[PDB]
Structure formats: C-alpha cells, structure tokens
C-alpha cells in the first residue's frame, strides 16, 4: 500500500527541499551537473561559454532524461568537485526533476581541507548535512569520498570522518574507487571499524573492473554495487589518449552485462546503476566534454533509453530492472535512525 | 594615471602609504563560503579584519595590496567589504599561488593568460572589481604548470600594464629563475616584484637581482617563531630569524643604493585556513600589531639606524605607487 502514497511519509532532502520517498521515483544515483572544482564556476563561467549556456545545456539534458523516466539524480559532486549547488537547484526547478546535493571530499581537496583533522572533516559534513550547504539552506543527502588505490592518510581520515557523519545523520555514503585496484575491500574495513552498517555504502565506479569474485564478495557482504558508469567508453575514439584514459576501452555492453551477472548470481538487491555523466567538465582536458558527448548524445537518459532495453531482452524482467532504478535507490537514500 | 581598488579605480596620489603584499584572509577558493564557521564566522572575519586595517590605517597606512588569488582563497566581496568599513585601499590580485586545482592546473599558458586578463579587464567573478597586480609563486625549481603561469602572467602584464609580483623560496634563489622565465616573455624587470625575499640572508643573490632592476619584497618581516622554538609547525612557517634580522636587510639595500627599488610589507593575515588549525592565533600572539608593524616597529627601527625620513617615504609611498601605476 504505503508504495503508493505521495501525500506524507519519510522524506529525502534535496536541492529544493524535502521529498517523500516515494516522491523520489527513477533514480540515477552518481551523476554530475557540472565537474569543477571549488570557485572555479563562479571565477570563469566563460570555460562553459557561459554560466547561462551551462544551465541551459544542463536543463535539456535533464528535460531528456525525464522525459525517458528519470525523476531524481543524486548529484555526487563535493565541495572540492565544484558543487555549485545553486546552479543545482536553478537547473533542478526548470527541469522538474528532483536532486540530490552531496557532502565529503573528492580527489582534488585544497590545503584547507587536506590539513584538517578528522574531527574537522565530521564537523564540516555535519554542516552541509545538518545546517547547509553554503548560505543556501540546501542540505546534503548523501555524503562522497574517494580512493585512488590505496588509500593516503589524509583519505583514511575522510572515510572515517564520513563514517562518523553518517552515523550520526543517518544519510548514505558513496564512494570512488579504483575498481581494479579493489579498493572497495579497504573501504569496507576502515567503514566498518567506525561501525557503519554495508547496507549505507555505495562502493562506486564497480563497473570498471571485470572481476566478479571481487564484485560479489563486497556484495556478499550487503555492500551496495554502484554500476555507475556504463555509457564510459572511447571505443571508436583510439586515437585520442585523453579520452582513452578517462573513459576506457571496455564497451557499454561489457559494463552493462556486469548488472545482469550480479542479478544471475542473486544480488540484484545490492546494485545501483547510474551513468556518471556530467553537462560541464573542467577539471580534465579542456574538449572533454564535446567529445563525451560526441559517444552518448543520450547523456543521463542513457540508462533508461539504452540500458533498459538491452537488459530487457537479455530476459532480466522489468520487475527487477524497476526494483534496481527505484526501489533500490529509494532504500539507499531514505536515512535511516541518528545514533543514540 | 589609475589603479583598480576592490572600491574602483584611484588616483597615484590616493595610494599612499602602501603595504604591498598583503592577505585579509588566507584560505583555499571556496572555503570562506562553504565553512565559515572554520573562522568563527564570516561575520567575525569582518570585524577582525576591519580592527585590523584601522589599526593599521591609524599608524599611517592608506593602501593594502592582498596578493591572495583565487587559489588562495580570494572573495573580493570580502575585501571590498573590509576597505570600505576601514577606508584603506585594497587592490586585489589574479594569478596562481601554490595550490591551483585541477580545473586551473590542466590549462594551457593560453588559457591562463586569459583567465588573468579577464580577472584584470573585466572583472573578478560577477563584482566588477577588477585586479591590480598579478601573483605568481614557485617553491624551489618550477614544475611544469608554474612555467605556464609565469609566463601567462607576463603575457597579461604587457597586455595590461599592470604589474606581476611573486612568492619565492628565497633561500633556492627562485628569483633567478622566475626573472629568466619573464625576460624570455619580453617583460621588463621594472614591473616585477620578486617576494619573499626577506627570507633569505644571501644578499648577493638580491643585489644582482636588482642590479638587473628587478624589485625587492622585504614583505614578510614580522615572520619569526622566536619564542615558539616547542612549536614545530609555526617553526617551519615563520623560520627561526628575528625580525630585526629581516629588517636590517631593509638598511643593507639601502646602504648598497637600492631604495628606489625596495618594497616592504607584513605578509599578514586576519584569518588563515591553509595551514594548521591554531596558526592564526599563534602568529597574532607573536605580532599583536598585525599589518601595523611595518609602521609602528620597523620604520623607528630604520629611523634610529639612521635612515632618514625621505627614504623611508619613498621606499613606501613613491616606490609602490610607481610599481602600481599600469604601464
Ligand atoms: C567529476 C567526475 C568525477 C568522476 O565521476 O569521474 C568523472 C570523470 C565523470 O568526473
Ligand atoms: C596566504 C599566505 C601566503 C604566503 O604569503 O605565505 C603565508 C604563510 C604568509 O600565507
Ligand atoms: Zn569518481
Ligand atoms: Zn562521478
Ligand atoms: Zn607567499
Ligand atoms: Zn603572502
């Protein structure tokens, strides 16, 4: 019954406000409107052209995706990704579809963040979860950390600062790894020294590993699986390293049959699918996002319009393809009792 | 004739007193924004700040330069806000100091150099206010994107007029360096600062620099963590020479026919993010007198030296305004 109601019940934040969950509907649970980094919109928004031609490449491409079922993203770019989340809450009001602003720390912090201890990592992802982020009100709903192999100190402190945060909020963590490094598996211990249950963990950008017995252990184990990155190829761009180095030389389709392995060995409940794509880019080359667009014109709709209907005809029922895009994310994103 | 202030342009005449390398607030681009709780608040940053300059603005100083750029965590709202509530001048800066992000190291010298023009020609951000000097810095041999940015700054300065002033590790002698990488740009020495250069006691380094007619930053004299020997942090910030070691360096460039060429500043802070959590309390408590040092220590310290008020007057008001003016 209570799948069915809209008009009360728990509630998710996001970039306009609270949500119900059931509100929430087809969500794309790692996504970017904008790869930056800090200040770096607002200081040169003629990189993008334009800050209007930013947003309004950002509300046709949300209007596309909505329009092949998307209703809600969750928007897991941090402070020292660029997060502009007023250009969030500008682009999620004309699109109409709902999203979800994130604390932690990406790959690229600054000094004022790289010196800070873990109790000031906690204090800082409290705030955006619990006051806001900047002076906008716009309360995070899910907390973002990153590896890159094994983890440095500094990156030891953000997972437990966000451990700590999460616990006390109750809102999820998801994470980047370097999938075939298996840096899900230290994620997972340092996690779970602080405590923090595996059903609250996305260990994100799984889909660029081919290792199964890896995948499935951390599943095993009620991690949740982020297939996030399945329109990530440069086939048919081999002569541009740039490109190739970012994006792999794995198909689409590799990574897509990866979400039916796990459903074939029984953890459809773990996995969470998303594109990982973004509308501006500058924290890379400066063409990188003409030529992303140039191999997936359908940007986020590409799960929904592409994805789907392969996995469909591969036998995986719409049933289960629905419980992945909407029930799954709904039991990620829903926060769960404060500690205490 | 003009120089852009974070409240417009002024006249040469309006600069006066300068300190010219200067911080309200040293942090990280966006930090101020996302946590101001870090400095208390964005409201108590103010009032420090603004206590400060009028401090700093009773014992005589009428123009500031805040060498922070947008990786240093610059909010020109911030400064504008601070002149105005403490009617000293401000003149704000673009470039790149030591902790670029990866949206600003992956750029080419091409964009950069435009990056730094629209900063000087257009405007910072969305404020109108427009920058004044150009910061650039290295630590020792330059990295790859540091020669980027020393030579996308001197691409900007001829274009511009306006000046380019730099951080060093004085000791390594980057001056040298810093100085090759802008006359293979065709910039003139005469609009560049090279700073820091208190840092070091190798006075032959700095002669033959301005021998060459570069400009000499004496800017950071109050730095020393005497007293502070337990504390390593602070220790390895500030160094281990006194301030009157840095500030007789200031009478040996005079002494040695230089005062044309001598700049002097504070390098002080009213909050500082990058670095470790206590240092803002631990230097105010070595240097209560904040950016009125210069003026209210080192002047009667030159003074009783013997080192007559003309000088001191042109190596504070004629000097900066001279390196200031564009072009
Ligand atoms: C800012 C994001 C982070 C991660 O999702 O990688 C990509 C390349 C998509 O950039
Ligand atoms: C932000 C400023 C930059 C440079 O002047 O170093 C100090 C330590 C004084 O911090
Ligand atoms: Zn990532
Ligand atoms: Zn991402
Ligand atoms: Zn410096
Ligand atoms: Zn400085």
């Avoid at 979800?100 to 004022?112: F, K, M, Q, Y």
């Avoid at 809102?171 to 994620?187: I, N």
């Avoid at 799984?206 to 991690?223: H, I």
């Amino acid at each position: 019954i209570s799948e069915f109601i809209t008009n009360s019940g728990d509630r998710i934040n996001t970039v306009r406000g609270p949500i119900t969950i059931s509100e929430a509907g087809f969500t794309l649970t790692h996504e970017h409107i904008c790869g930056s980094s800090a200040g770096f919109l607002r200081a040169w928004p003629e990189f993008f052209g334009s800050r209007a031609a930013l947003v309004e490449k950002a509300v046709r491409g949300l209007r596309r995706a909505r329009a092949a079922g998307v209703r809600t993203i969750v928007d897991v770019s941090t402070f020292d990704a660029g997060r502009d989340v007023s250009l969030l809450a500008e682009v999620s009001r004309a699109a109409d579809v709902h999203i979800v602003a994130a604390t932690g720390l990406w790959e690229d912090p600054p000094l004022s963040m790289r010196l800070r201890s873990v109790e000031e990592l906690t204090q800082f992802f409290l705030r955006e979860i619990q006051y806001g982020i900047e002076d906008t009100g716009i309360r995070a709903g899910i907390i973002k950390v990153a590896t890159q192999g094994k983890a440095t100190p500094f990156q030891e402190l953000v997972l437990r600062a966000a451990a700590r945060a999460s616990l006390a909020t109750g809102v999820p963590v998801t994470t980047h790894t370097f999938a075939s490094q298996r840096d899900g598996e230290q994620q997972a211990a340092i996690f779970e020294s602080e405590g923090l249950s595996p059903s609250r963990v996305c260990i994100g950008h799984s889909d660029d590993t081919d290792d199964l017995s890896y995948l499935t252990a951390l599943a095993a184990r009620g991690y949740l699986i982020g297939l996030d990155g399945i329109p990530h190829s440069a086939i048919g761009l081999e002569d541009n390293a740039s490109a190739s180095a970012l994006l792999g030389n794995r198909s689409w389709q590799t990574r897509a049959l990866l979400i039916k392995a796990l459903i074939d060995q029984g953890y459809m409940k773990q996995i969470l699918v998303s594109n990982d794509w973004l509308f501006g880019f500058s924290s890379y080359v400066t063409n990188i996002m003409d030529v992303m667009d140039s191999v997936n014109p359908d940007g986020m709709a590409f799960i929904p319009l592409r994805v789907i209907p392969f996995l469909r005809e591969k036998g995986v029922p719409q049933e289960t393809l629905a419980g992945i895009t909407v029930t799954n994310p709904a039991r990620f994103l829903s926060p769960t009792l404060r500690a205490s």
